[PDB]
Design an enzyme around this catalytic site. Structure first.
Site, mmCIF file in Angstrom:
data_model
loop_
_atom_site.group_PDB
_atom_site.id
_atom_site.type_symbol
_atom_site.label_atom_id
_atom_site.label_comp_id
_atom_site.label_asym_id
_atom_site.label_seq_id
_atom_site.Cartn_x
_atom_site.Cartn_y
_atom_site.Cartn_z
ATOM 1 N N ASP A 133 0.836 -1.208 0.000
ATOM 2 C CA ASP A 133 0.000 0.000 0.000
ATOM 3 C C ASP A 133 0.869 1.255 0.000
ATOM 4 O OD1 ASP A 133 -2.387 1.463 -0.155
ATOM 5 O OD2 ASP A 133 -2.768 1.373 2.004
ATOM 6 N N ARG A 137 -0.222 9.164 0.794
ATOM 7 C CA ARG A 137 -1.016 9.267 2.014
ATOM 8 C C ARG A 137 -0.482 8.388 3.144
ATOM 9 N NH1 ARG A 137 -3.633 4.401 0.841
ATOM 10 N NH2 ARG A 137 -3.707 4.169 -1.450
ATOM 11 N N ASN A 138 0.394 7.425 2.844
ATOM 12 C CA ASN A 138 1.027 6.574 3.849
ATOM 13 C C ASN A 138 2.470 6.967 4.160
ATOM 14 O OD1 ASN A 138 -1.225 5.007 4.391
ATOM 15 N ND2 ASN A 138 -0.834 3.641 2.653
ATOM 16 N N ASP A 151 2.149 2.737 7.864
ATOM 17 C CA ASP A 151 1.040 1.843 7.519
ATOM 18 C C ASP A 151 1.421 0.379 7.342
ATOM 19 O OD1 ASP A 151 -1.499 1.491 4.917
ATOM 20 O OD2 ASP A 151 -1.474 0.828 7.004
HETATM 21 C C1 LIG Z 1 -2.926 12.961 11.732
HETATM 22 C C2 LIG Z 1 -1.793 13.756 11.889
HETATM 23 N N1 LIG Z 1 -0.645 13.199 12.280
HETATM 24 C C3 LIG Z 1 0.487 13.894 12.455
HETATM 25 N N2 LIG Z 1 1.628 13.293 12.860
HETATM 26 C C4 LIG Z 1 1.709 11.966 13.101
HETATM 27 N N3 LIG Z 1 2.841 11.364 13.516
HETATM 28 C C5 LIG Z 1 2.750 10.014 13.691
HETATM 29 C C6 LIG Z 1 1.529 9.487 13.442
HETATM 30 C C7 LIG Z 1 1.100 8.198 13.535
HETATM 31 O O1 LIG Z 1 -0.009 7.915 13.082
HETATM 32 N N4 LIG Z 1 1.883 7.263 14.147
HETATM 33 C C8 LIG Z 1 1.432 5.973 14.270
HETATM 34 C C9 LIG Z 1 1.498 5.084 13.185
HETATM 35 C C10 LIG Z 1 2.001 5.462 11.936
HETATM 36 C C11 LIG Z 1 1.035 3.778 13.336
HETATM 37 C C12 LIG Z 1 0.522 3.347 14.553
HETATM 38 C C13 LIG Z 1 0.470 4.228 15.626
HETATM 39 C C14 LIG Z 1 0.916 5.539 15.499
HETATM 40 CL CL1 LIG Z 1 0.815 6.573 16.895
HETATM 41 S S1 LIG Z 1 0.499 10.771 12.945
HETATM 42 C C15 LIG Z 1 0.449 15.268 12.212
HETATM 43 C C16 LIG Z 1 -0.760 15.836 11.798
HETATM 44 N N5 LIG Z 1 -0.886 17.149 11.542
HETATM 45 C C17 LIG Z 1 -2.239 17.739 11.400
HETATM 46 C C18 LIG Z 1 -2.270 18.899 10.415
HETATM 47 N N6 LIG Z 1 -1.162 19.842 10.629
HETATM 48 C C19 LIG Z 1 -1.229 20.473 11.956
HETATM 49 C C20 LIG Z 1 -2.273 21.595 11.989
HETATM 50 O O2 LIG Z 1 -1.935 22.620 11.045
HETATM 51 C C21 LIG Z 1 0.109 19.127 10.436
HETATM 52 C C22 LIG Z 1 0.292 18.025 11.462
HETATM 53 N N7 LIG Z 1 -1.847 15.068 11.651
#
Ligand SMILES: Cc1nc(Nc2ncc(C(=O)Nc3c(C)cccc3Cl)s2)cc(N2CCN(CCO)CC2)n1
Length: 270
Positions: A133, A137-138, A151
């Protein structure tokens, strides 16, 4: 690696994942300085099968250690809610990050992003892990623009989630043979996503329209302002014969050469 719940502070909900919320928080463990983390939570009301699928991502992530692969900090499983903690990627997903910044990064910056992705994939292929995948987006992006593959999961596709047609090599669609060479096809699609600042591959074409077009020799055209050498590398990734595609070490090498000889990126189609 089980993390004591008392070491975890949730600060803000920042997104929505497959099983629940995605949060930013802080992790402080005895003897270690506080660090920023991303946190996924699984709250009550799920089947035991769902809990296993959620936690399987942590099991797989924990097998890897590489600067372009998301790093696992640990899990919370002896308490509710269940949680997975990783490093925090300040810029989120690559496709939406590029759309927000359309035209605002240079070719050399975009190539650096692609090089990091390719290095992560070179490592996964060396570990005999097929992603299946690979898509912008990943990919997650940090404050320094470092790009990391995310992912992770080993569950079969529905036909064996559904197969992501627009990103998938034709032999993987037709025969369900997923290999590192089919991940190379997907990587070519990611290159096109990056050089187009997050445009949707194949625009408004249906899934069946994409399948038929690829079989009839259509390939995506160079994005606006894209160096011809980068589009040619995309076309190499999209060879119908999987054995003719470059392997990930060759892809990293080609990108390293572009970074070192940036004058070669000046040729663009007219
Ligand atoms: C949804 C999101 N994630 C961000 N950073 C992440 N880092 C790590 C993540 C994560 O998923 N890790 C993970 C994985 C991969 C697997 C299992 C378990 C886990 Cl814990 S998600 C930043 C973000 N932003 C929103 C929009 N902007 C801010 C406002 O202006 C920029 C920033 N949005």
């Amino acid at each position: 690696k089980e993390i004591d719940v008392s070491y975890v502070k949730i600060e803000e909900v920042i997104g929505a994942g497959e099983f629940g919320e995605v949060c930013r928080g802080r992790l402080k463990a005895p003897g270690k300085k506080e660090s920023c983390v991303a946190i996924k939570t699984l709250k009550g009301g799920y089947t035991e099968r769902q809990r296993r699928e959620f936690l399987s991502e942590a099991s797989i992530m924990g097998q890897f250690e590489h600067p372009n692969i998301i790093r696992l900090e640990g899990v919370v499983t002896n308490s509710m809610p269940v949680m997975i903690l990783t490093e925090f990627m300040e810029n989120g997903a690559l496709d939406s990050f590029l759309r927000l910044n359309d035209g605002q990064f240079t070719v050399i910056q975009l190539v650096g992003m692609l090089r990091g992705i390719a290095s992560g994939m070179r490592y996964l292929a060396e570990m005999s892990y097929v992603h299946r995948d690979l898509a912008a987006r990943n990919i997650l992006v940090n404050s320094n623009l470092v790009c990391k593959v995310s992912d992770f999961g080993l569950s079969r596709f529905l036909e064996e989630g559904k197969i992501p047609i627009r990103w998938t090599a034709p032999e993987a669609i037709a025969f369900r043979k997923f290999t590192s060479a089919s991940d190379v096809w997907s990587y070519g699609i990611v290159m096109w996503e990056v050089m187009s600042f997050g445009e949707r591959p194949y625009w408004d074409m249906s899934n069946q329209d994409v399948i038929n077009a690829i079989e009839q020799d259509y390939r995506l055209p160079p994005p606006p302002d894209c160096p011809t050498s980068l589009h040619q590398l995309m076309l190499d990734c999209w060879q119908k014969d999987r054995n003719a595609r470059p392997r990930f070490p060759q892809i990293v090498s080609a990108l390293d050469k572009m970074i070192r000889n940036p004058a070669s990126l000046k040729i663009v189609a007219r």
